[PDB]
């Protein structure tokens, strides 16, 4: 039984590359206007959202895509946002957020001269709406290609949103006085 470990970057250069990308991405994502992400997504990018099948996640329900449960090809097709315009327009409709970027657990699982796949695990708080202050947990998988600068250009983005567990909430909100 291999011990579970934190973020896996493979190399220091990739760690710097991906963490920088994430800092810049979420600075825009949590800003109140996500249009700046248009520069982060490929013209033909894909984005889809999924949530648990099994504090409500009602605002994420309409766009949730679970192909194991939804069988209709047409509905499956429409639920997959395609082109940076539709991807970012959709993202800007989702609840405003505040992600704990520095606590992200990141796994870079694939890499070639044209591809980089990494998944981000963490939490984010909703800043307004009916679920104001709720803490959500998420796992987001990105596939990006090299960007004409030294950055990344996202071609695939799958976001899985769920409620944070009791243990996750306790850990995320704790701030006990220091003790020996």
């Amino acid at each position: 039984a291999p011990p579970c470990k934190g973020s896996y970057f493979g190399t220091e250069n990739l760690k710097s590359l991906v963490l920088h990308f994430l800092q810049q991405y979420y600075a825009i994502y949590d800003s109140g206007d996500r249009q700046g992400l248009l520069d982060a997504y490929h013209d033909g990018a894909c984005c889809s959202l999924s949530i648990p099948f099994i504090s409500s996640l009602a605002e994420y329900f309409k766009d949730s895509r679970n192909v194991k449960k939804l069988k209709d090809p047409t509905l499956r097709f429409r639920l997959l946002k395609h082109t940076r315009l539709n991807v970012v327009a959709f993202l800007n409709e989702l609840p405003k957020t505040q992600h704990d970027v520095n606590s992200f657990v990141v796994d870079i699982s694939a890499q070639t001269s044209t591809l980089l796949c990494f998944s981000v695990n963490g939490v984010f708080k909703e800043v307004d709406g009916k679920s104001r202050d709720s803490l959500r947990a998420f796992t987001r998988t990105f596939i990006a290609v090299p960007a004409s600068n030294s950055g990344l250009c996202i071609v695939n983005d799958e976001l899985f949103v769920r409620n944070a567990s009791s243990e996750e909430i306790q850990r995320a909100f704790a701030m006990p006085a220091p003790t020996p």
């Binding site: 039984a1 291999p2 011990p3 579970c4 470990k5 934190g6 973020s7 896996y8 493979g10 490929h42 033909g44 990018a45 894909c46 889809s48 999924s50 949530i51 648990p52 099948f53 099994i54 895509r65 679970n66 192909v67 194991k68 449960k69 090809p73 499956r76 097709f77 997959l80 395609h82 657990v105 796994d107 870079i108 699982s109 694939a110 070639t112 044209t114 591809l115 796949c117 998944s119 695990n121 947990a137 796992t139 998988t141 596939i143 990006a144 290609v145 071609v155 695939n156 799958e158 899985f160 769920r162 567990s165 243990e167």
Partner: protein
């Protein structure tokens, strides 16, 4: 595009739903056959641990305790040509619970990239890259 986008989306869903069924069925009831679902150069980042090569993957899988997976969420997307030139690939993301013998049931998230291998008979989809992590890996 030379091929309609919806064609890629439909193909991605079919390949993903069927592969997921085979993958976890095999994981739970035919563990020794699991590594054959992977490409020779495939890697797996399991809870922050990198496992490289089909041979190492086979040993890793036989090393792990018996399992019982319950899959509840599957989503997938056709991967853009620019990321995998001349190679048809599909991103698959899974969420569910799993109980490994010797420990309590826990939720997990897994994502892998499948690659299409044309051949005499039908097209064969195999894992080129894999990533698995327990939602409560820290405990």
């Amino acid at each position: 595009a030379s091929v309609d986008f919806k064609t890629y989306v439909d193909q991605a869903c079919r390949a993903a739903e069927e592969f997921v069924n085979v993958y976890y069925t095999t994981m739970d009831k035919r563990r020794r056959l699991l590594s054959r679902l992977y490409m020779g150069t495939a890697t797996l980042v399991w809870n922050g641990n990198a496992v490289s090569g089909q041979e190492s993957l086979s040993e890793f899988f036989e090393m792990l305790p018996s399992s019982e997976f319950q899959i509840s969420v599957v989503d997938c997307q056709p991967v853009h040509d620019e990321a995998t030139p001349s190679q048809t690939t599909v991103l698959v993301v899974i969420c569910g619970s799993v109980k490994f013998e010797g420990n309590k049931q826990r939720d997990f998230n897994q994502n892998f990239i499948l690659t299409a291998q044309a051949s005499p008979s039908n097209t064969v989809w195999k894992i080129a890259s894999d990533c698995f992590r327990f939602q409560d890996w820290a405990s």
